[model samples]
Target: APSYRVKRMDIAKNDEECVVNAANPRGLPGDGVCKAVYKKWPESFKNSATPVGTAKTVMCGTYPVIHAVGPNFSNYSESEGDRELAAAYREVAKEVTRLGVNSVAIPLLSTGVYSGGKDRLTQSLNHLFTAMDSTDADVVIYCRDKEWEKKISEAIQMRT
Candidate 1:
C-alpha cells in the first residue's frame, strides 16, 4: 500500500528515515532548503553532477540524504518542465525502494528558484502521487510555506 502526507516545515525538520534535497545537478550548494541541508552536513554537495530528473544518496549520520535534481525552468519550456519534474519524482521513488527505507520526506522539487508556481505545485503533487502509488513506502512532503502545505494537502485529498 502507498500513503503520503504533507507537513508545514523544512524537510530537514522531519524525523523520517530519509530526507530529500531539491538539489543542483552540478552538486553545488543552493539557497533555502538545499542550503539548510548543506549547512547541517557540509558533505551534502560532494556528489558529482547528477543529471536532471535523477537522484543520488549521501548518508548523513543515521539518515540518508537523497539529492534529487529537477528541471530548471529558466531554460525549459512548460512541456519539458512538467516531464522532467515528473521524472524527478519517479527517481525519488526509485531511490526510496533502492534504500529500502520504510519512509522518506520529499520536497516540491523545482518549486523554488527552479521556477515553479501554483500550477507547477499541483502538477508536482499529481506526479508524485502517481509515482508513490507504485511502491509501499510511506511518503511525507515537507513544505516550507503554509499555502504550499495547504495546496499539497488538498491535492492529496483529490487523489486519496
Candidate 2:
C-alpha cells in the first residue's frame, strides 16, 4: 500500500501543483476562474509581458509552481470564442506534448458566473474535448463534487 498504490482515483489524478490561466498581457483577469485567480494573486492580473499566442500567468494556491496562460471561457461557436478556445488549447497541447507530460486537468470553463445557461457546459465540452484530442494528456474535468462528476461522466459517455 506504500509504493504508489492507488495512484489514480476515478478520473481524478493524484495531487500536483501547477495551473494555467486565460489571463491577458501583464496578467489581467479573464472571467470567472481568473477572477478567483486574480483575487489570490491580483498582481498576476496587472499588465505584463507575454509572448504572442501565449497566456500570461501568476503563481498561486498550494505551491502551484508552474503558472501559465491559456484560453478563457467564451463563445467558441460565435467565431470569437471558438478561435480563442481553440488557440489556447492548441498552444497548450503543443507545450504539454513537448514537455512529455502525462495529463491535463481543468474545470468547466464557464460553468459558473459566466455561464449564460443555454447548455454552456455542453458547449464548453465540445471545444475542450477537441482540445483533449489535440494532445496525448489524460485530460480530466473536475466538478464541485461527486454527483456532478457522475453526471459529467455520463454526459461525456453519451458524446462518444
Candidate 3:
C-alpha cells in the first residue's frame, strides 16, 4: 500500500527506518544533522564511494539497518553527474524496500551545497518514487528549514 504524509519537523519520531548523512567523499560529517545523529548512534552512519545510484547499509540504534545514499546531493541533476546522484537515491530506495524497511526518512538530497533547484530536486524524487515497486514503504523527506517544507510537500504530492 502507498502511504504519504507531511510534517514540519526534520526528524520524524516514528519510522521503521530513517536517512541521515554518512561521510561525504571528503570524509567529514558535512553538517550538523549528520554530526548529531552520528554522535548519538555512531554505527548508523557510513561512508559511500559508489557512483551515484548506490547505497550502503549500517545499523542504527535498535532499527534493523539504515541505508545511506551517497556521492552527495550535488551529484544529482539533469547533467550526467547529477543523474548518477538521482540513480543512487533510486537504487537506495529499491534496496531499502528489498531489505523490508517499511518506512524511511529522507532529507532533501543535493539541495544544500549541491546546488540543485527545487524543480530539479522534485523531479529526481519523483523518479525515485515512480521506480519503486512496493508502496509498502513510507518515505518522509525531512526539511529543517521551514521554507523547504512546502517545496518538499509539493514534490511528494506530485507523485500522486
TM-score list, all predictions = 0.91, 0.56, 0.72
C-alpha lDDT score of every prediction, in listed order? 0.82, 0.48, 0.55
In order of listing, the candidates' clash counts read: 0, 7, 7
Q: Which clashing pairs does model 2 show? A: 26-47, 26-48, 27-45, 55-69, 75-81, 76-81, 76-82
Tens digits of per-residue lDDT for model 2 on 2-113? 0101111321232423344444444455555555555555554445346323543334432231224433334334556546555555555565565565655455544454
Highest TM-score among the candidates is held by which one? Answer: 1
RMSD for each model, in Å, please? 1.7, 6.6, 3.4
Better of 1 and 2 by TM-score: 1
Superposed by TM-score, candidate 1 places the C-alpha of residue 84 at a distance from the truth, in angstroms, of: 1.1
- Candidate numbers sorted by lDDT from highest down: 1, 3, 2
**Candidate 2 global TM-score:** 0.56
Q: By lDDT, who's the top model here?
A: 1
Candidate 3 Cα misplacement greater than 4 A, ranges: 12-14, 20-23, 46-52, 64-78, 116-120, 133-135
Candidate 1 structure quality by residue, lDDT tens digits, 35-141: 88888766656663589988888886667888888898887888998898889889888888988999988888887788744347867778888777887888999
For model 1, which pairs clash?
none
On lDDT, the stronger of 1 and 2 is: 1
- In candidate 2, stretches whose alpha carbon ends up further than 4 angstroms from where it belongs are 1-18, 22-26, 29-32, 35-77, 116-118, 145-148
Question: Regarding lDDT, does 1 or 3 come out ahead?
Answer: 1
State the RMSD for candidate 3: 3.4
